[PDB]
Amino acid sequence: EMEKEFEQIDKSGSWAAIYQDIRHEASDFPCRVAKLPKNKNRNRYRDVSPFDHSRIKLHQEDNDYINASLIKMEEAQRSYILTQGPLPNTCGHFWEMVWEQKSRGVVMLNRVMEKGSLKCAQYWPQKEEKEMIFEDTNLKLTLISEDIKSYYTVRQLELENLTTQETREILHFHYTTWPDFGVPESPASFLNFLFKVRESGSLSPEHGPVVVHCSAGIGRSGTFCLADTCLLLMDKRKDPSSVDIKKVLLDMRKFRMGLIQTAEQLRFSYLAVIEGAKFIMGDSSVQDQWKELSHED
Ligand SMILES: NC(=O)[C@H](CCC(=O)O)NC(=O)c1ccc2cc(C(F)(F)P(=O)(O)O)ccc2c1
């Protein structure tokens, strides 16, 4: 029982313990390819690498490496590609990955400038008159429109494979107020963001997996995916009471290491899922409650 467990853990103040027990149970698979001397500059962080069994491969011959993982949730029937914030030298690989995996949406949960350093490279154009070209991967990216809100910006991008001259629309959902190792403003804000992503059609099975990222591609990225997966499960299982957030997070960590970086982020996932459960069990008629509470404007 989810809500019961939440109160139980809250009262005794066991969030750090619960979280740490999860870390101590977390799967462990090799990241041999990530550690090859030729991929050192393709990794943002030394301790954050994709497992070999689930890493996304680039359809390049000389080097198919990119720090990205395919989180394949079998029961929930949803895949997500979690990846690190692109480096100055991996933006072409990033968009290449987007192209080859046929993703339709990209979810950015961090800021290019967090605290005081490159927490991510500026991988999309900021002005529609100044398209970006990644000569290494033969891709062109142009900004078509932007929809700025208080805590998130949604963008329409046109990615073109210059070899094929084929064009595609990519939706970019950027959560601009989620601090590294921090939590969203509230379950409402987060859920308002999640549902807009759901509504765009970016998560549909007719498209490639949505590409989700923050700085390392594990904390905020993990919190986002855990919530979405648990909500999916509560909408599918005979009884949502059976959805164990802890077990869900553990199956996710079989695909990428370090998902959810703080006890507070795990606690927030409980909060987000419980709140989101309300608007899945019929009461969806008042979803606008989140849009109002999130402020948005
Ligand atoms: N300089 C490094 O590469 C060290 C290495 C630490 C070690 O080797 O033990 N690791 C990091 O700097 C390092 C590791 C995980 C992070 C995780 C986050 C994050 F949780 F906020 P995320 O949501 O962006 O994944 C942000 C920054 C993060 C930095």
Quote the CA–CA distance of 97 and 194 in Å, as a whole number. Answer: 22
| CB neighbour list of residue 134: distance below 8 Å, 6 or more residues apart | 91, 92, 95, 96, 140, 141
Index of the ligand 1 atom closest to the CA of residue 110: 24
Q: Is the minimum distance from the CB of 110 to ligand 1 under 6 angstroms?
A: yes
| Closest ligand 1 atom to Cα of 222 | 23
Question: What element of type H or E holds 2?
Answer: helix 2-12
Rounded-to-integer distance, Cα 228 and Cα 170, Å: 20
Task: Give the list of residues 6+ apart from residue 59 with CB closer than 8 angstroms, or none.
Answer: 96, 100
- Measure the CA–CA gap between 197 and 96, rounded to whole angstroms: 22
Q: Nearest CA to 99 among 70, 138, 71, 41?
A: 138
Please give the order of strands across the beta sheet that includes 78-83: 68-73, 78-83, 210-213, 105-108, 166-175, 152-161, 139-148, 132-134
Task: Compute the C-alpha angle 198/202/207, nearest 5°.
Answer: 135
C-beta 48 within 6 A of ligand 1 = yes
- Mutate which of 23, 35, 43, 48 for ligand 1? The one with the most ligand atoms within 8 Å of its CB, which is 48
Ligand 1 proximity of 276 Cβ (cutoff 6 Å): no
CA–CA separation, 135 vs 130, rounded Å? Answer: 15
C-alpha span between 127 and 262 (Å, rounded): 36
Comparing CA positions, the residue from 87, 97, 99, 80 lying closest to residue 159 is 99
Residue nearest to atom 14 of ligand 1 (CA): 45
Could you state, in order of their start, the residue ranges of all structural domains in the chain?
1-297
> How was this one solved?
X-ray
- Minimum CA distance residue for ligand 1 atom 12: 45
Give the CATH superfamily of 1-297: Protein tyrosine phosphatase superfamily (3.90.190.10)
Look at ligand 1, atom 1, and give the residue with the nearest C-alpha. 45
Task: Decide: helix, strand or coil at residue 218.
Answer: coil
Spatial distance between the Cα atoms of 119 and 87, rounded to a whole number of angstroms: 9
Cβ 240 under 6 angstroms from ligand 1: no
Q: Which amino acid makes up residue 212?
A: V
Beta strands in the chain (DSSP E): 68-73, 78-83, 105-108, 132-134, 139-148, 152-161, 166-175, 210-213
Question: What is the Cα–Cα distance from 149 to 295, expressed in whole angstroms?
Answer: 9
**Among 31, 214, 225, 230, which one carries the catalytic annotation?**
214
Q: How far apart are CA 16 and CA 9, in angstroms?
A: 10
Taking a C-beta distance cutoff of 8 angstroms, is the pair 205, 170 a contact? Answer: no
Q: How far is the CA of 278 from the centre of ligand 1 (A)?
A: 34
- Measured in angstroms, the resolution is 2.3
Separation CA 73–CA 226 (nearest Å): 10
Check if 214 has its Cβ closer than 6 Å to any atom of ligand 1: yes
Identify the residue whose tokens are 């996304």.
Answer: 56
Beta carbon of 183 within 6 Å of any ligand 1 atom: no
Q: Which residues are CB-neighbours of 93 under 8 A, at least 6 positions away?
A: 42, 58, 65, 66, 86, 137
- For 73-104, what is the HEC assignment? ECCCCEEEEEECCCCCCCHHHHHHHHHHCCCC
d(CA 124, CA 159): 10
The token pair that represents 44 in the structure block: 């943002």
Count how many residues are written for the chain: 297
Contact by Cβ (8 Å): 161, 98: no
Q: Nearest-5° angle of CA 31, CA 219, CA 277? A: 120
Distance from Cα 219 to the centre of ligand 1, integer Å: 9
Q: Supply the DSSP symbol for 142.
A: E
Known catalytic membership, residue 214: yes
Tell me if residue 69 falls in helix, strand or coil. Answer: strand
From the CA of 214, give the closest atom in ligand 1. 24
- Token digits of residue 109: 């949960």
Q: Which of 229, 214, 222 is nearest to 173 (CA)?
A: 214
Tell me the CA end-to-end span of the chain in Å, nearest whole number: 36
User: What is the C-alpha radius of gyration for the chain, rounded to an integer number of angstroms?
Assistant: 19
Q: Are 221 and 82 in contact (CB under 8 A)?
A: yes
Taken in order 52, 120, 266, 151, is the CA torsion positive or negative?
Answer: negative
**Which residues, 6+ apart, have CB-to-CB distance to 106 below 8 Å?**
98, 170, 171, 172, 173, 210, 211, 212, 213
Closest CA to 174 of 211, 128, 227, 129: 211
| Cα–Cα dist 64/56, whole Å | 8
Is the Cα torsion angle 27, 33, 34, 35 positive or negative in sign?
Answer: positive
